[PDB]
Write an enzyme that holds these catalytic residues in place. Sequence first.
Site, short mmCIF file in Angstrom:
data_model
loop_
_atom_site.label_atom_id
_atom_site.label_comp_id
_atom_site.label_asym_id
_atom_site.label_seq_id
_atom_site.Cartn_x
_atom_site.Cartn_y
_atom_site.Cartn_z
N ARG B 9 40.05 37.84 26.71
CA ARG B 9 40.12 38.98 27.61
C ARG B 9 38.92 39.88 27.33
O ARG B 9 38.78 40.41 26.22
CB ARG B 9 41.44 39.73 27.41
CG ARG B 9 41.68 40.87 28.38
CD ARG B 9 41.69 40.35 29.81
NE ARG B 9 42.91 39.58 30.08
CZ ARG B 9 43.12 38.91 31.20
NH1 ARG B 9 42.20 38.89 32.15
NH2 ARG B 9 44.27 38.26 31.37
N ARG B 10 38.05 40.05 28.34
CA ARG B 10 36.78 40.76 28.13
C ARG B 10 36.98 42.13 27.49
O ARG B 10 36.27 42.49 26.54
CB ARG B 10 36.05 40.92 29.47
CG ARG B 10 34.78 41.74 29.37
CD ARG B 10 33.68 40.95 28.68
NE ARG B 10 33.61 39.59 29.20
CZ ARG B 10 32.54 39.06 29.77
NH1 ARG B 10 31.42 39.78 29.89
NH2 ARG B 10 32.57 37.82 30.22
N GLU B 39 25.87 30.02 33.26
CA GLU B 39 24.56 30.37 33.81
C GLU B 39 24.61 30.46 35.33
O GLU B 39 25.59 30.98 35.88
CB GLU B 39 23.51 29.37 33.32
CG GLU B 39 23.30 29.43 31.80
CD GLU B 39 22.27 28.43 31.31
OE1 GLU B 39 21.87 27.55 32.10
OE2 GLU B 39 21.87 28.54 30.13
N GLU B 82 42.20 29.79 33.45
CA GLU B 82 41.71 28.95 32.35
C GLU B 82 42.86 28.33 31.56
O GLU B 82 42.78 27.17 31.16
CB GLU B 82 40.81 29.78 31.41
CG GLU B 82 39.48 30.18 32.05
CD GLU B 82 38.63 31.16 31.23
OE1 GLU B 82 39.18 31.91 30.37
OE2 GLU B 82 37.40 31.18 31.45
C1 LIG Z 1 34.02 37.14 37.33
C2 LIG Z 1 32.62 36.62 36.83
C3 LIG Z 1 31.36 36.86 37.44
N1 LIG Z 1 31.12 37.62 38.66
C4 LIG Z 1 29.75 37.93 39.05
O1 LIG Z 1 28.85 37.55 38.37
C5 LIG Z 1 29.45 38.76 40.36
C6 LIG Z 1 27.96 39.03 40.54
C7 LIG Z 1 27.63 39.75 41.88
C8 LIG Z 1 27.84 41.13 42.00
C9 LIG Z 1 27.54 41.79 43.22
C10 LIG Z 1 27.03 41.05 44.31
CL1 LIG Z 1 26.65 41.89 45.87
C11 LIG Z 1 26.82 39.67 44.20
C12 LIG Z 1 27.12 39.01 42.98
N2 LIG Z 1 30.44 36.25 36.70
N3 LIG Z 1 31.03 35.62 35.61
C13 LIG Z 1 32.39 35.84 35.68
C14 LIG Z 1 33.47 35.32 34.67
C15 LIG Z 1 33.13 34.41 33.68
C16 LIG Z 1 34.12 33.97 32.80
N4 LIG Z 1 35.35 34.41 32.89
C17 LIG Z 1 36.31 33.94 31.99
O2 LIG Z 1 37.75 34.80 32.19
C18 LIG Z 1 38.07 35.32 31.05
C19 LIG Z 1 37.73 36.83 31.05
O3 LIG Z 1 38.68 37.50 31.83
P1 LIG Z 1 38.35 39.03 32.32
O4 LIG Z 1 38.51 39.95 31.17
O5 LIG Z 1 39.28 39.42 33.40
O6 LIG Z 1 36.81 39.10 32.86
P2 LIG Z 1 36.28 40.23 33.89
O7 LIG Z 1 37.06 41.50 33.69
O8 LIG Z 1 36.46 39.75 35.31
O9 LIG Z 1 34.62 40.54 33.60
C20 LIG Z 1 33.77 39.43 33.26
C21 LIG Z 1 32.46 39.76 33.62
O10 LIG Z 1 32.38 40.12 35.08
C22 LIG Z 1 32.00 41.34 35.12
N5 LIG Z 1 32.75 42.08 36.14
C23 LIG Z 1 33.94 41.72 36.66
N6 LIG Z 1 34.32 42.67 37.60
C24 LIG Z 1 33.33 43.63 37.65
C25 LIG Z 1 33.16 44.86 38.43
N7 LIG Z 1 34.19 45.29 39.41
N8 LIG Z 1 32.07 45.57 38.24
C26 LIG Z 1 31.13 45.19 37.35
N9 LIG Z 1 31.26 44.06 36.61
C27 LIG Z 1 32.35 43.28 36.76
C28 LIG Z 1 32.32 41.96 33.61
O11 LIG Z 1 31.60 43.23 33.39
C29 LIG Z 1 31.99 41.06 32.84
O12 LIG Z 1 30.47 40.98 32.63
C30 LIG Z 1 37.18 34.56 29.97
O13 LIG Z 1 37.81 33.50 29.54
C31 LIG Z 1 35.90 34.15 30.76
O14 LIG Z 1 35.33 32.90 30.20
C32 LIG Z 1 35.71 35.28 33.83
C33 LIG Z 1 34.79 35.76 34.74
#
Ligand SMILES: Cc1c(NC(=O)CCc2ccc(Cl)cc2)n[nH]c1-c1cc[n+]([C@@H]2O[C@H](COP(=O)(O)OP(=O)(O)OC[C@H]3O[C@@H](n4cnc5c(N)ncnc54)[C@H](O)[C@@H]3O)[C@@H](O)[C@H]2O)cc1
Lengths: 140, 140
Positions: B9-10, B39, B82
């Site tokens: 969980r991030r 990547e 996952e």
């Molecule tokens: C979902 C995702 C993204 N998406 C983008 O690249 C969008 C780019 C984009 C933006 C604008 C435009 Cl026009 C076009 C393109 N790339 N890679 C991931 C990702 C990778 C891995 N897992 C795994 O799932 C578990 C974690 O679970 P979580 O704790 O839920 O992870 P998240 O909270 O979703 O954050 C994870 C990262 O996405 C960022 N993020 C999420 N939402 C926001 C938000 N509203 N504002 C700013 N940043 C946000 C966060 O800052 C972190 O850098 C682990 O096992 C992981 O291996 C989950 C998610």
Amino acid sequence: TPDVFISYRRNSGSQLASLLKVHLQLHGFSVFIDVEKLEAGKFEDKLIQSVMGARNFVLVLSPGALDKCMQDHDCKDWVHKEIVTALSCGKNIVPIIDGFEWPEPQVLPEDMQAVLTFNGIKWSHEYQEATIEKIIRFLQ
Amino acid sequence: TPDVFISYRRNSGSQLASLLKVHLQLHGFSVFIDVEKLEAGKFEDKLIQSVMGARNFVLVLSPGALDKCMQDHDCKDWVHKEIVTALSCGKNIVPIIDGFEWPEPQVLPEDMQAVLTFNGIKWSHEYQEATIEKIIRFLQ
Ligand SMILES: Cc1c(NC(=O)CCc2ccc(Cl)cc2)n[nH]c1-c1cc[n+]([C@@H]2O[C@H](COP(=O)(O)OP(=O)(O)OC[C@H]3O[C@@H](n4cnc5c(N)ncnc54)[C@H](O)[C@@H]3O)[C@@H](O)[C@H]2O)cc1
Ligand SMILES: Cc1c(NC(=O)CCc2ccc(Cl)cc2)n[nH]c1-c1cc[n+]([C@@H]2O[C@H](COP(=O)(O)OP(=O)(O)OC[C@H]3O[C@@H](n4cnc5c(N)ncnc54)[C@H](O)[C@@H]3O)[C@@H](O)[C@H]2O)cc1
């Protein structure tokens, strides 16, 4: 005598403090962290001696890590005590910031407000390798 | 193709997940964690294929780590997705418990309740090397 003392808040910075210890050891620094190096005896004097003996003082600033320092006028909090010891010995203080809100100096005890004059390093989950290299540059 | 996928969980387990990656790599495992190996391209397919490719699925259970899984029946939470992939593929699931309250099964979506059937490892701040050694014994 370790080159690096790691001070941290148990209930919020233990993981980062441990991550820091591993990385710094891999790059050749001798590190004191309590769970590895604080052994038998009266811990108060060993902690003070260990801060006094380390060139570098790495302060892990996790969320809320200085909350218990505030109002601790009698110096009862151990992070407060470790910081004051480092300030008093002129140690090279290296704050590591991880989601920590910078306090206004007025809220900290006078004997540690000087901690805010040291240049800190922002922990980057996304660029941890670069964060580590910056820390190592900051170390003596 | 990495041997170990680290799901976490991030907002609560990024430091432990990172510490786990450092230790497992030092002991010669190829590790997938998103911030180092996710990547370019559509991340949805890359994450699912990375879970599939890794024999071992290391689940970082930090405090509240499964809160966003609860009532996520359309499987839009990424930790949920996952876990379901690892369950579906019959992976060697290794939960790492770091101050996590065990949920009762009925609060989790049906498709991930089986995660509670896997033997977990308690993260010990005081005996970290021993924790790491047990994790390695659990790995395949
Ligand atoms: C979902 C995702 C993204 N998406 C983008 O690249 C969008 C780019 C984009 C933006 C604008 C435009 Cl026009 C076009 C393109 N790339 N890679 C991931 C990702 C990778 C891995 N897992 C795994 O799932 C578990 C974690 O679970 P979580 O704790 O839920 O992870 P998240 O909270 O979703 O954050 C994870 C990262 O996405 C960022 N993020 C999420 N939402 C926001 C938000 N509203 N504002 C700013 N940043 C946000 C966060 O800052 C972190 O850098 C682990 O096992 C992981 O291996 C989950 C998610
Ligand atoms: C204070 C101390 C003790 N004392 C004992 O050995 C008593 C044994 C004993 C018991 C019963 C009897 Cl008849 C006779 C003897 N040894 N070494 C330390 C210590 C070492 C280093 N630093 C540094 O200060 C910053 C952390 O600051 P903090 O975040 O404040 O850390 P603490 O919260 O104080 O806990 C830190 C550790 O003591 C444990 N602990 C504290 N209180 C309780 C409690 N009420 N119940 C159960 N366990 C407690 C905690 O579980 C952790 O294992 C870092 O920089 C550190 O380098 C602080 C404290």
